[PDB]
Amino acid sequence: NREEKILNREIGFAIGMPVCEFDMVKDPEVQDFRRNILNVCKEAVDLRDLNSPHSRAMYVYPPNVESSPELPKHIYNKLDKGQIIVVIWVIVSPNNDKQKYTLKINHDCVPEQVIAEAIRKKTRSMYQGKYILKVCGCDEYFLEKYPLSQYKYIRSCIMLGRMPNLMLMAKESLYSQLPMDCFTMPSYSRRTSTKSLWVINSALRIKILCATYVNVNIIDKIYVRTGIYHGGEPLCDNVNTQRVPCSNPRWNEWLNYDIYIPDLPRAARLCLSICSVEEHCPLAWGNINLFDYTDTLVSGKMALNLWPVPHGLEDLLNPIGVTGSNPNKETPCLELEFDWFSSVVKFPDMSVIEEHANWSVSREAGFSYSHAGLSNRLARDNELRENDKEQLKAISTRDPLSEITEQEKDFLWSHRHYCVTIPEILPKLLLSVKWNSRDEVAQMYCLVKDWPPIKPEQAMELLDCNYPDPMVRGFAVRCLEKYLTDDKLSQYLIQLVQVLKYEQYLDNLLVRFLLKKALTNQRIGHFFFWHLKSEMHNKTVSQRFGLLLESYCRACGMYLKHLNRQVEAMEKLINLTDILKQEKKDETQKVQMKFLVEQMRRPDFMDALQGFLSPLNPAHQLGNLRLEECRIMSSAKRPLWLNWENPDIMSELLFQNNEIIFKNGDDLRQDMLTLQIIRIMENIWQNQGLDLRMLPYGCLSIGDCVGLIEVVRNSHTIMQIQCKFNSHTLHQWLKDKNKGEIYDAAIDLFTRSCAGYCVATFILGIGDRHNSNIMVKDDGQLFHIDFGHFLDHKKKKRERVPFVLTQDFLIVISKGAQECTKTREFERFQEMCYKAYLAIRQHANLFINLFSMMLGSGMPELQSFDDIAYIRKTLALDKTEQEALEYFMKQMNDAHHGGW
């Protein structure tokens, strides 16, 4: 047991709460999750010891590869006849003397071939399966047989015109360093009648007894508002209790609902709230799953602790809110009573559902012309015309925020069998289902059961708040299991972690998929841990995320120990910054720095703040902290500028110092999402041969309004440039930094990165640009920082241009010409914008879905589908492609007072 106790201390330190608190949770769902999730843990551990040591090395150091080995024409043209120059370093003599070997090989060469060529060059100077290639300066390895150019490091080197520097390491040098972890099963591994829902011939009714902890200001009259929901879709009309004074919240009233108990869908929920009053106002709210995790209908007495109303929610009910009782018991508590049927009621099995769907399909197949004429949801098989097929195809092209009329819904449902031939229509077909009809739902189940697979980015939509059904969500997860690459999983990890909150139960297919991937890929596992840990202060998700983190920490292996180093380093940094903002806030920079350096030099702190992996990128080792290079930044919330040595043997070939900005006080979640979207945008542009280089620098939220920002070396704000001022200062600075022949490359890089940031900021509705949030690298790469604001943040009770190209920017674009607006350079720059704008337009659904998946997150500027609709306005989705280009030009023309 000594091993178990110690490991529980390690897991508790990682999660930020003791494991014993989980053991005390009475709720059977919680204890069943803890026990049953362990098979995902076992499965993942089995996959890792399948082909050991190689399979273990693949888990710890997965290949950091692109999704496809194909190169866009513009990237291939950067290669000398499809060949790349590569530098291979062999550490040999004592005191680690470095021998370099320059190779000109095909871009498609496998690491083993690269090693053979290196051995050839070293032998000419006077086995291949005994070495591995490592990226110089960081812990990135090439353990798998992918073409060299498919490795992200290599592709980046090709794209940026950089020399790839790789190090020949012995297989045994790496293998001996990966410890053998023996995953142990925890102590908790060792643990009337029953009627079907469809045999309950009764209407729904729920009793509202009384409310406790209704502490309000003498508010002069209150009631309970209730409704039956399927996602955010009401299943019947809302039912309110009679009004009562808040001084005595007693109702003892059965509420009768307009729904037959057998018609209740699987994901049906009771959404309620205590309202005051005419200006009706919600005081507290709470949601409940009408069926528990065991598929049992709610029976008996239940007490539900309510949640405080979130600012901006005028609506009396909160359906897209969290389901379950508030963990804090010193909150308004509502007592409810459910119906009793003298037996346990369960949701029918798939076999019963299938028998019923086949019975319905067969019955409908025999319907006469006139019977089918009774309903617009009924359509005879052979009546399917080509015009109808064309209408179905047109509907499937519409964006997820485009309204589907009641007529289109009846249309889609009656043609559901033809819909299988155009499988991407599934999200529209599902919103057209009468979720309060068991006859229709049973048939939808069977259609989904055998539904053709759709793209992972299309399936992701089916995991958002509009799709609560577990059969639907199960199909989505299966598409991800079959077609989502680890690369794309990493890219969309924030969205996939968010959509976990929309799950009715702790144990589901999505969490099993995500956990298995985190436990079989340490790069995925790293960010999985941090995304969950960053939200552990949020009581809406702390039990879910806490239980998930416990399962992750039991099976991740040795990485727990490394994570605990990063957790301890962040904890010390939160502690220091918290003191500086509450105890030393008014003191000078010189004084504050003296306190900081004295605190940091304490042996306990000094050890905790050095020799750990960067949470921004775990391939980066943070060695000794360079205190003399550290500083308190004069910016808002006084962030810490931190500098560590990169202890890697060949750090000089990557970077010798790792500089990170630690910030305590601002919410960094909107920045992370924007930075992710900028990268996705750049990826779309690059694939279409549209070379607009963006700078989606690293940003990670590690807690409540705490996080890390990746520093971009040799980059300066426009204000830093002009504060050496004329409009020619910037262009003169770039000319000075790019003297000679290389000048044109800087102007091209500037105009290209400028076009990208113009289009990206206009689409996304980012916070207003100024000379302190626009940065420029010495080579001419323009980029933006501080993405705290996006979408419709300047809304009133209509669209903006956040990046207005002042004379300074146009002078650079036009190479110093006076009439910068009327030059061929500016005409070429406009063309880059138009193409960039239209390309994003073609991928609008992806962007709409990425934002829709982030709705359950507590982001201030992303609270409703109305906020996402801003992107539907900027992309001009209701207009044609030419009208959309015209609208963009007009927005640009108005903001710049001419030119477009």
Ligand X SMILES: CC(C)[C@@H]1COC(=O)N1c1cn2c(n1)-c1ccc(N3CCC[C@H]3C(N)=O)cc1OCC2
- Near ligand X by CB under 6 A, which window of 77-85, 286-294, 593-601, 714-722? 714-722
3-state helix, strand, coil in the chain (%, to 5): 45, 15, 40
Count CA atoms closer than 13 A to 31's CA, side-chain side: 11
Closer Cβ to ligand X, 265 or 639, answer by number? 639
Regarding 711 and contact with ligand X (CB under 6 A), the answer is yes
Contacts of 850 (CB under 8 A, 6+ apart): 492, 495, 673, 676, 677, 680
Positive or negative, the CA dihedral 223, 228, 231, 232 is: negative
Regarding 348 and contact with ligand X (CB under 6 A), the answer is no
Closer Cβ to ligand X, 298 or 661, answer by number? 661
User: Minimum Å distance from CB 700 to ligand X?
Assistant: 12
At residue 644, φ and ψ (nearest 5 deg) are: -120, 155
Contact criterion met (CB below 8 Å) for 709 and 663 = yes
User: Minimum Å distance from CB 776 to ligand X?
Assistant: 10
- Give all strands of the β-sheet with 774-777 in edge-to-edge order: 715-717, 774-777, 782-784
Closer Cβ to ligand X, 526 or 663, answer by number? 663
Closer Cβ to ligand X, 169 or 712, answer by number? 712
Closer Cβ to ligand X, 550 or 682, answer by number? 682
Closer Cβ to ligand X, 225 or 663, answer by number? 663
User: Minimum Å distance from CB 775 to ligand X?
Assistant: 6
CA distance 171 to 49: 17
Positive or negative, the CA dihedral 408, 410, 414, 420 is: positive
Regarding 87 and contact with ligand X (CB under 6 A), the answer is no
Regarding 715 and contact with ligand X (CB under 6 A), the answer is yes
Minimal CA–CA distance to 268: which of 478, 470, 498?
470
CA distance 89 to 165: 7
User: Minimum Å distance from CB 637 to ligand X?
Assistant: 8
Regarding 264 and contact with ligand X (CB under 6 A), the answer is no
Q: Which member of 663, 789, 800, 872 binds ligand X (CB under 6 A)?
A: 663
Estimate to the nearest angstrom the gap between the alpha carbon of 860 and the chain centroid. Answer: 16
Residues in the chain: 900
Q: Which member of 631, 716, 735, 873 binds ligand X (CB under 6 A)?
A: 716
User: Minimum Å distance from CB 861 to ligand X?
Assistant: 16
Closer Cβ to ligand X, 415 or 784, answer by number? 784
Contacts of 758 (CB under 8 A, 6+ apart): 803, 805, 833, 836
Regarding 635 and contact with ligand X (CB under 6 A), the answer is yes
Closer Cβ to ligand X, 239 or 708, answer by number? 708
At residue 443, φ and ψ (nearest 5 deg) are: -70, -40
Regarding 579 and contact with ligand X (CB under 6 A), the answer is no
Regarding 639 and contact with ligand X (CB under 6 A), the answer is yes
Q: Which member of 391, 599, 688, 720 binds ligand X (CB under 6 A)?
A: 720
In the shown chain, the binding pattern of residues 738 to 777 toward ligand X, with x for contact by CB under 6 A and - for none, equals -------------------------------------x--
Q: Which member of 322, 709, 776, 820 binds ligand X (CB under 6 A)?
A: 709
Closer Cβ to ligand X, 627 or 711, answer by number? 711
User: Minimum Å distance from CB 699 to ligand X?
Assistant: 7
687 to 706, contacts with ligand X by CB under 6 A?
Answer: 697
Q: Which member of 169, 401, 558, 661 binds ligand X (CB under 6 A)?
A: 661
**483 Rama sector, left if φ>0, alpha if ψ -120 to 50, beta otherwise:** alpha
781 to 820, contacts with ligand X by CB under 6 A?
Answer: 785-786
Minimal CA–CA distance to 287: which of 360, 342, 336?
336
User: Minimum Å distance from CB 666 to ligand X?
Assistant: 8
Closer Cβ to ligand X, 520 or 781, answer by number? 781
Regarding 39 and contact with ligand X (CB under 6 A), the answer is no
Amino acid letter for position 246: C
Minimal CA–CA distance to 410: which of 441, 379, 389?
379
**Cis status of the peptide bond prior to 53, with omega within 30 of 0:** yes
Minimal CA–CA distance to 700: which of 474, 444, 888, 497?
497
Closer Cβ to ligand X, 286 or 707, answer by number? 707
Regarding 236 and contact with ligand X (CB under 6 A), the answer is no
Contact criterion met (CB below 8 Å) for 539 and 327 = yes
User: Minimum Å distance from CB 676 to ligand X?
Assistant: 14
Regarding 712 and contact with ligand X (CB under 6 A), the answer is yes
Cα separation values, 732 from 721, 757, 775, Å: 10, 22, 16
Binding site for ligand X (CB under 6 A): 633, 635, 639, 661, 663, 697, 709, 711-713, 715-716, 720, 775, 785-786
